[PDB]
Amino acid sequence: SGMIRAIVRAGQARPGPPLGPILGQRGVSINQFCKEFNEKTKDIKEGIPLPTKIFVKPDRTFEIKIGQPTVSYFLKAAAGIEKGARHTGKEVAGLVTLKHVYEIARVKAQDDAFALQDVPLSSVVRSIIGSARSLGIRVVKD
Amino acid sequence: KFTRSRIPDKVFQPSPEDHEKYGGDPQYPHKLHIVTRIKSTKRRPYW
Amino acid sequence: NTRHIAFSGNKWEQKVYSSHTGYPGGFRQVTAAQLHQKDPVAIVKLAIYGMLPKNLHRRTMMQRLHLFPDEDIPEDILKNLVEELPQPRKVPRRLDEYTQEEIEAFPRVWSPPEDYRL
Amino acid sequence: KTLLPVPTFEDVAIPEKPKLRFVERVPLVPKVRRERKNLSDIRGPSTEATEFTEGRFAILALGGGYLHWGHFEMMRLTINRSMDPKNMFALWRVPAPFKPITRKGMGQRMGGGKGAIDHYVTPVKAGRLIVEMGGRCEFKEVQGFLDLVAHKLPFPAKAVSRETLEKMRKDQEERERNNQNPWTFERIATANMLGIRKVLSPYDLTHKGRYWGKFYTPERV
Amino acid sequence: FKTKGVLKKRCRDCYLVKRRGRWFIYCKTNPKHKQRQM
Amino acid sequence: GSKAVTRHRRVMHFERQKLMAVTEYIPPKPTINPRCLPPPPTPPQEETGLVRLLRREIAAVFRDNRMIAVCQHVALSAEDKLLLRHQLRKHKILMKIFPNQVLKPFLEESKYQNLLPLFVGHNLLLVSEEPKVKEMVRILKGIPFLPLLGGCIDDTILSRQGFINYSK
RNA sequence: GAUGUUGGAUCAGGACACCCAAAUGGUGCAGCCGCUAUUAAAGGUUCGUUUGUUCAACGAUUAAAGUCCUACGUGAUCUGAG
RNA sequence: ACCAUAGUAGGCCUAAAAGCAGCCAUCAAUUGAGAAAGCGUUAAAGCUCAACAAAUUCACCAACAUAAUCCCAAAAACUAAUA
Ligand SMILES: [Mg+2]
Ligand SMILES: [Mg+2]
Ligand SMILES: [Mg+2]
Ligand SMILES: [Mg+2]
Ligand SMILES: [Mg+2]
Ligand SMILES: [Mg+2]
Ligand SMILES: [Mg+2]
Ligand SMILES: [Mg+2]
Ligand SMILES: [Mg+2]
Ligand SMILES: [Mg+2]
Ligand SMILES: [Zn+2]
């Protein structure tokens, strides 16, 4: 009956918003998903909140595919900042190297969306670079 | 007001084809006019 | 043959004949179609009546006009007729009237495509 | 299908105070002495404010007319709220109203004097630009919401740009050189033929019969 | 219906038809968009 | 008497109305109308960057593809199409799409003519580099309504039964 | 060298910019009431208390107790409270 | 007509703010799809527009209720007119 995007933190999944308001509307059992989503996600101790796709079926049961963490967060950690710049491109938030984009790209290469795209590491790198440019995070290439 | 008006000179400068049209001779102007009165002097100014 | 009058344009629908009985609320207005339905003679009669000069002689010459809805005329009036007048309007033919000679003789203007269904 | 190069604005500069200014109901130095009403200042073609300055767009007046305060109110609120303040700016091509208009109370017999001052108005001649809108927008936007303010003015009015204006003017003289009938209003009125000058006004020589009273007819050659 | 001076389609689903020598706006999605030119 | 300027539009003295009706604009009248004249002169189009890019890329397309198959483009959900592209990735087989407008007149020049009737419909060009036919047919066997009309292999135009043969 | 002027009485002719009756569109129309819009002038459109009063208030009802014009209809038909 | 996946509910705010309350940015996958022009939702979810692909092309500058005795020549596409 519906498809639910949610970007959810590693060790944190709880029977309340956004999880309650979104999945609970479809009539989905929250606790099952808390314990299961955590079963997979608690095991990421590197502290990286992951966008995750929850398909809900007409009988109100559900399945979930866990994706790699958002690029915004990978750049937040790679540049070591707190939050993105208030004004992007007017103000620079943090710095990353030619290496950082390579890493963040090779990590996110396996996304449900990037899996079906053959395009090489250069293109995924350009993607990470755009997602950086919106965050106010500059690239430095040596 | 109403007035005696005027006619600006350009009116009276004939084009080349007006000779061909009214059958006037371009070289020599003609000596006498035959003037007939077609319309009334009523409803017209005194002058 | 009065009943078979033709009216040019849309006149059948929008020409009105008005009459008044003189009694308050005695004002009638009839559409040419309805008037022609009730009285087959009426239309040509009011046509002619309005075209004579307006003097008294109108009434008299109005008396010498004889109108018949179809072609049925008493032997009396048939027997005393002198002359046949020419039709003012030329009545156009329909499609079925044309001799096959004439239809075959007329050019087929455009070339129709075969794959088009007609 | 087919791509075509998109028109770009590299030279378009957005000035400060981009919105229309507020015009004052009464002049700051109020006229003390009631003036005769010249119909003549609404009459015929316009001289001032015929040409663009900074902007690409304008509202062109296709008749003469009297603009009073309530109109300014409309054009102002409307054109301000309708436009993108980043990409667009507007300008008054018309002064704030300087001409006193007089009334007498109701139930007044004729005579006794001239009445008292009720009003203030700006005279506007046919062929003048009321509002000038510059910006990096295409004429389609401005034309979209300008047509409202035009439609709401006293005189008939149009929404135009430089290209539009020049096109319609070149066409306007094309008609006068394409004219197939030997007789134009100019030729007759100037040659006083058929003593026509008896029915015509003295201003008729200049208007060439295209303007009549307050109204303007664009199709008159 | 409404008798109007100027018809204008209010949504994507208004179709504009000439009947009885008038212009009507008919709309199946919403009836309140019905108009009739005078 | 009415003032020189008024709003009620001001009826004109009759002699002036006649003056008006005489001086109206009369438009130039053609001997023969332009559209009913013969065809206009020729406004020929010219190659853009896109047209040169497509001619050159399509020219390279017949070079690199050893098996060029024409598979009718059929509407599948983004799911089916992406899964399809991933399987084609798994055998390394490629798929490419082109505009019919620029693909058509290129093949109407010299070599590849026999493909012309196949390109009037909706087409999808299956690019096969060092291919095996069995594997290309593997996928078109899974989904029934996604037909293969064949085309060019090593300069020879070949059809469905032919591919059934080259596979075996 | 006079076109006698308010309101009633009597008798009403007409308009439709419908108050009722008659067909219908839309609704923030479930139904009952409604609120709006379109088409329709053959017929209707009350009786009282106070004011000279038309207007207005108020009592009681009706399917409704229309808005107007006709020399603010109508005094060689009537009434003069004004 | 036909059709609609991608990082990514871009940052920032915010109860939430996911194109679509406002500020900033306008980037980068695909061959092709705006960090979005409509509606829509509490926010989502969902409908269409723009992009290919398939074709064919012809246009666009639209209009405006009524009065009081009873409508107000009759009619009319055409035998030739500087009458
Ligand atoms: Mg106006
Ligand atoms: Mg007398
Ligand atoms: Mg009556
Ligand atoms: Mg009515
Ligand atoms: Mg009645
Ligand atoms: Mg009276
Ligand atoms: Mg009386
Ligand atoms: Mg009397
Ligand atoms: Mg979504
Ligand atoms: Mg792109
Ligand atoms: Zn609609």
Q: Which domains does chain A have, with CATH numbers?
A: 1-67 (3.30.1550.10), 68-142 (1.10.10.250)
In which domain, by residue range, is C53 found? 1-118
State whether D196 and F20 contact (CB < 8 Å): no
The answer to whether the beta carbons of residues A30 and A24 sit under 8 Å apart is: yes
Classified as helix, coil or strand, A34 is: helix
Q: Enumerate residues 6+ apart whose C-beta is below 8 A from C45.
A: C65, C67
In three state form, how does the secondary structure of A5-31 look?
EEEECCCCCCCCCCHHHHHCCCCCCHH
Q: Which residues contact D5 (CB under 8 A, 6 or more apart)?
A: none
Neighbouring chains of C at 3+ CB pairs under 8 Å are none
Give contacts of D198 with chain B, Cβ < 8 Å. Answer: 2, 44-45
The count of domains in chain C is 1
Q: Is B3 helix (H, G, I), strand (E, B) or coil?
A: coil
**Phi, psi angle pair for D101, to nearest 5°:** -120, 140
Enter the resolution in angstroms.
3.4
- Verify A-F touch: 3 or more CB pairs within 8 A: yes
Q: Which residue of D has its CA nearest to F24?
A: D220
User: CA dist D115 to D27, D38, D109, D163, F83, Å?
Assistant: 19, 16, 12, 47, 87
Phi, psi of F127 (to 5 degrees): -90, 120
Identity of the residue in D39, D209, D219 whose CB atom sits nearest the CB atom of F5: D39
Q: CB of residue C92 closer than 7 A to nucleic acid strand H?
A: no
Interface of F with D (CB under 8 A): 3-7, 9-10, 12-13, 15-16, 19-20, 22-29, 48, 50, 101
Quote the minimal CA–CA distance from F16 to chain D in Å. Answer: 6
CB within 8 Å: D192 and B8: no
Neighbours of chain B (3+ CB pairs under 8 A): D
- Distance from B2 to chain D by nearest Cα, in Å? 7
H or E element: which one contains F66?
Answer: none
Q: Angle at CA F73, nearest 5°, toward F69 and F75? A: 150
Solved using: cryo-EM
Rounded to 5°, the CA angle D120-D122-D123 comes to 130
Gap from CA of B41 to ligand 7 centroid (Å): 60
- CB-based burial label for A54 (10 Å; 0-12, 13-18, 19+): buried
Whichever domain contains C80, its CATH number is 3.90.1180.10
Rounded CA separation D79/D147 (Å): 11
Could you tell me the distance in Å between the CA of residue D13 and the C1' of nucleotide H68? 66
Sign for the pseudo-dihedral over CA of C10, C14, C18, C23: positive
**Measured CA distances, A89 to A81, A141, D207 (Å):** 16, 18, 60
Nearest 10 degrees: Cα torsion F22, F26, F32, F36:
-130
Neighbours of F71 (CB within 10 A): 19
C-alpha to C-alpha distance for D35 and D99, rounded to whole angstroms: 8
SS3 C25: coil
Cα–Cα distance between E15 and E27 in angstroms, integer?
6
Note down the domain range covering F72. Answer: 1-168
C-beta separation of A125 from A102 below 8 A: yes
On the 0-12 / 13-18 / 19+ scale of CB atoms within 10 A, F135 is middle
Q: Indicate the pairing of strand D57-61 with strand D157-161.
A: antiparallel
Identity of residue F84: L
Q: How far is CA A72 from CA A77, A80, A110, A139, D145, in A?
A: 9, 12, 16, 14, 41
How many Å from the N-terminal Cα to the C-terminal Cα in chain B?
Answer: 15
Determine the distance separating the centroid of ligand 3 and the alpha carbon of C4, expressed in angstroms: 44
Tokens of F91: 């055998």
Point out the ligand nearest to the CA of residue D71.
Answer: 1
Cα Rg of chain D, angstroms: 21
CB contact, 8 Å: D199 with chain B? no
- Which residues of F does the annotation place in the binding site for Zn(2+)? 36
* Three-state SS at F70: strand
The rounded Å distance from CA C15 to ligand 5 centre is 28
As a whole number of angstroms, the distance between CA E36 and CA E23 comes to: 6
Q: Residue D42 carries which DSSP code?
A: T
Strand H, nucleotides < 7 Å from a protein CB: these are 2-13, 16, 18, 23-31, 33, 35, 42-46, 48, 52-55, 62-65, 69-71, 73-77
Estimate the crossing angle of helix A121-133 against helix A98-107, to 10 degrees: 110
D contacts of B44 (beta carbons < 8 Å): 195, 198
In the reported structure, the alpha carbon of residue C6 is separated from the centroid of ligand 6 by a whole-number distance in angstroms of 54
Instruction: Please state, in angstroms and rounded to a whole number, the distance separating the CA atoms of residues D34 and F26.
Output: 48
Class of residue C71 by CB neighbours under 10 A (exposed 0-12, middle 13-18, buried 19+)? exposed
Residues 30-89 of C with CB under 7 A from strand H: 46-47, 49-51, 89
Angle of helix A121-133 versus helix A71-78 axis, rounded to 10: 80
Domain count, chain F: 1
* Contact (Cβ atoms closer than 8 angstroms) between residue A40 and residue A52: no
Tokens of C98: 């044309």
E34 alpha carbon – ligand 11 mean position (Å): 8
3-state secondary structure (DSSP) of residue D38: coil
B38 touches chain D (CB under 8 A): no
How close is the nearest chain A Cα to the Cα of F89, in Å? 7
- Provide long-range contacts, Cβ within 8 A and 24+ apart, for F28-31: F28/D178, F28/D180, F29/D180
CA of A139 to the centre of ligand 10 (A): 22
Assigned token pair, C27: 């004002």
Tokens of F71: 């598979």
Helices (H), chain F: 14-22, 49-64, 78-90, 100-107, 133-142, 160-167
Gyration radius (Cα) of chain E, Å: 9
**What is the strand order of the sheet D88-92 is part of?**
D88-92, D129-135, D57-61, D157-161
**DSSP letters spanning A66-108:** EPPPPHHHHHHHHTT-SS--SSBTTB--EEEEHHHHHHHHHHG
Distance of CA B39 to the CA centre of its chain: 15
- The whole-angstrom separation of Cα A140 and Cα A131 is 15
Nucleotides of G under 7 A from a protein CB: 13-14, 25-27, 29, 37-39, 42-43
Taking all atoms of strand G, which protein residues have CB closer than 7 Å? C 24-25; E 1-3, 30-32, 34
CA neighbours within 13 Å on the CB side: how many for F139?
22
A18 backbone dihedrals φ, ψ, rounded to 5°: -70, -15
Is F50:D3 a contact under the CB 8 Å cutoff?
Answer: yes
Contact D190 B8 (CB under 8 A): yes
Q: How far apart are the first and last CA of chain A?
A: 50
Exposed, middle or buried: residue A125 (CB in 10 Å: 0-12, 13-18, 19+)?
Answer: middle
Give the DSSP H or E segment for B27.
none
Distance F127 CA to G49 C1' (A): 105
Point out which residues pair with A117 in neighbouring strands: none
Q: How far in angstroms lies nucleotide G40's C1' from the CA of residue E26?
A: 25
The gap between E2 CA and G22 C1' (Å) is 22
CA distance F77 to chain A (A): 14
Nearest-10 Cα torsion for F96, F102, F107, F113: 90
The helix (H) or strand (E) run that includes residue D9 is: none
CATH code of the domain containing F68 = 3.30.70.1730
Between the alpha carbon of residue D35 and those of residues A72, C83, C110, D109, D125, the distances in Å are: 72, 84, 75, 21, 19
Sign for the CA dihedral angle at D183, D190, D47, D68 comes to negative
Q: Is D173 on the interface with F (CB under 8 A)?
A: no
The whole-angstrom separation of Cα F140 and Cα F160 is 11
B7 contacts chain D (CB < 8 A)? yes
- The span from the CA of D211 to the CA of D64, in Å, is 10
* Inter-CA distances, F160 with B42, F95, F147, F163, Å: 102, 18, 9, 5
Q: What residues are paired with A66 via a beta bridge?
A: A52
**Measured CA angle at A60 (ends A57, A61), to 5 deg:** 70
Q: E31: closest CA among E7, E2, E5?
A: E2
Query: Position of tokens 């019969």?
Result: D209
Task: Tell me the pairing of strands F151-153 and F156-158.
Answer: antiparallel
Q: Please answer yes or no on whether D190 and B11 come within 8 Å at the CB atom.
A: yes
Q: Which amino acid is at F15?
A: E
